[model samples]
Target: HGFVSGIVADGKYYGGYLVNQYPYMSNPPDTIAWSTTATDLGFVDGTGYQSPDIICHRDAKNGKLTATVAAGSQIEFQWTTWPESHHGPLITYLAPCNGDCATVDKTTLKFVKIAAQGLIDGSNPPGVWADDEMIANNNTATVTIPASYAPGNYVLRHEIIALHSAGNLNGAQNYPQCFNIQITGGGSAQGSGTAGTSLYKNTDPGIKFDIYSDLSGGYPIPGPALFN
Candidate 1:
């Protein structure tokens, strides 16, 4: 039950939708993260895995502001707070904006995996995961834009998949957040990606896994493989 309250990109702070603002106040703050009606701090589940909500969150809209970052630079997505009970992977992806990211249609965008960190130590059942690392880092998930990525306008999709209750059917929680970013100074290689809907399925082993049991077999991340 958390959202990216702010982000540090290229050593600059870009804002994010505040629960106290949107869904309440008439004036919403401009931010690189898409504005969403996730004031409740809830998440989508297997029931709605294929819905538009999975792209970002409930009733999300493209942000009017975009953060400027350089290729190979890192951006820290800071969450309001993340509970220790929530344990899973932290994944990040990027989708070209085509033209204006503020008005880009999310459904038409193709996303490519940029960063993914899942189970780190599987010696213990439900062992340390990216979720634990994030909490240890003060709820900040960092992603470095690919050095080979072409200079262009893109939308960053940062996500968290909580697997605490994943032992049961339709029990996993999905928290997907999107931010607009313009990357500068990179190679000519552009990203080839997949649609958000094609990213993961609720029935996927990684998404429907049981965290309470032994995980030494390895936890395969549930999305497209890393671009490079």
Candidate 2:
């Protein structure tokens, strides 16, 4: 419970109120992160990428990702975008084509991958970050990537059919699924900020009235303040 500093409630005139504040703010769920080398497809609709209050993936619910594999299977991941279009898909963690490291940590849902291509589509690849390793049942498994951990631009692509077994492939099917990713921690206070002016609120006041700062067009009112 929190004691509000000020706010009238009942006849007794209590200045504060008891408020129960949830401590753990859930990270904006279902965000995306992409590799720099990935192709630029387009943007995902804002409503399709899945998160409690984030992106949703409705179009890609049942899609297949196939790549040309002369040596190995090629893969790609998904991204998120604003001003959405028609296509939007959800991305999860990934794993090797086959491995002892083939499983999803339900608690963390994190899977680590060393192979660059095996990661399919991800940002900060080739190291132990938050892993999105979707395991396979001999060839298929679930990998859930939390939005709180990953939040940024991403691509949505996966390979349903393998070219060979050597795992040397490029160009995944649905190669151009693009979207935006809005992570919370992205905005660092690295610089200054700016503000704009606008009218806040008012009733008719029984008669017409106006507050200052309501200047006319083409007329310069106040510039920057002169600190004396």
Candidate 3:
């Protein structure tokens, strides 16, 4: 596992802000990246808990990035060799920080699901595996800020939940990563509900599901409904 090394916005690649590090580092990117400092990084949150780890990550508040983005702009997360076997849905969330996202307290942070993409049905060049496409590419994922999103400081939580082995209990894997940014421009889009600490549960259908089987019916995403 690795932290997002850079972000693309306004047709340019920006670095020097994202927390880029392998999950195995003595000090993980933050608590959200790893539940405990003593825990080594790899894949999945071994704890098997659906809630985000806001209690132990002390670097998040101070590690906020200085990137500024517009409400309706497109941003891409640059990853590093994401595993293909770890296939599942990739989701994005936004948590308004009132003022400066860098200085906001982790406990007070709340989020709303903003964007989500998962496996597709049969196709000519591809199968029903979105995460595999992410791995096929340069390990990068993209999403757009809601055009109606309000302007302000916010924390963006991007994650990939690999359900390859979710057939068994506690077999689901969650890999969540967070980024801080300031949204500019004027917009009236307001996100509702809270995420992060209360996003999903281990028993939820979406959280604990089987992706290997046919999903032609529908793929129910875990967490609150997407904000409009």
Candidate 4:
């Protein structure tokens, strides 16, 4: 129910899109965070996951600015606010733009999971989720880029999938935000990405599981595996 407010990469702060302000600002600054028309800070649910909207947010567009960071840098994403009750997994994916990220067609963007944290203690009823710690961490989260990842222009897709209502079909909320990044430093490893629409289905274990019930079976996160 929150949106990324800003991002810290390579020790520099790059302001994120502010839906609240974008609608009123006479002149908005170009930022690394993609722009979204989500005025209510809502997520893509229902059958939208099978559409291109799942890649970012509602009617999302590429970020105007690109943050430069080394391959192994620790990048922190700052959220305007994340609720305590919206317990879910925090996942980060990466997709190569190949050329210019600002003008690249979002529909052509495919992604590979780079980092993710889901259910922590499933033994506890309505068990601890990644959001619990993420909230405690000031609604902020960090991920370290692989040092050997290929150097290129990339769109970083960070998302939070709230499973509170996941017991029902199409009840999972997908809050996906994207950023333009220019990965520096020498690296060569590349990931074969999966299309955004193909990332998950409502029937996926993690997408439709009931967190309020027995979670003894374990949570299998949706989407492709972490990039190696």
lDDT of 3 by residue, 97-176 (tens): 78876677766777888888876663322245667777766788888988788888777777777777876766767766
Tens digit of lDDT per residue, candidate 4, span 23-109?
A: 567667798988888888889985898787888888888888899989998899898678877889999998999898999888898
* Local accuracy by lDDT, each model: 0.87, 0.19, 0.64, 0.87
Which one wins on lDDT? 4
Reference-based TM-score, model 1: 0.96
Evaluate residue 188 in candidate 4 and report its C-alpha lDDT on the 0 to 100 scale: 90
Q: Candidate 1 residues 114-197, lDDT tens each?
A: 899999887877788998898889889899888888988998999999999987888889999899999998877776898987
Which model is ahead, 1 or 4, in terms of lDDT?
A: 4
- Residue 70 displacement in candidate 2 (angstroms): 37
Q: How do these models rank on lDDT, best leading?
A: 4, 1, 3, 2
Candidate 4, superposed: residue stretches over 4 Å from native: 24-27
Instruction: State the lDDT of candidate 2 residue by residue for 71-133, as single tens digits.
Output: 112222211211111111122222222211112111221122112222232222221111123
For candidate 1, the C-alpha RMSD (Å) to the true structure equals 1.1
C-alpha lDDT (0 to 100) for residue 119 of candidate 4: 88
- Each candidate: how many clashes? 0, 39, 2, 0
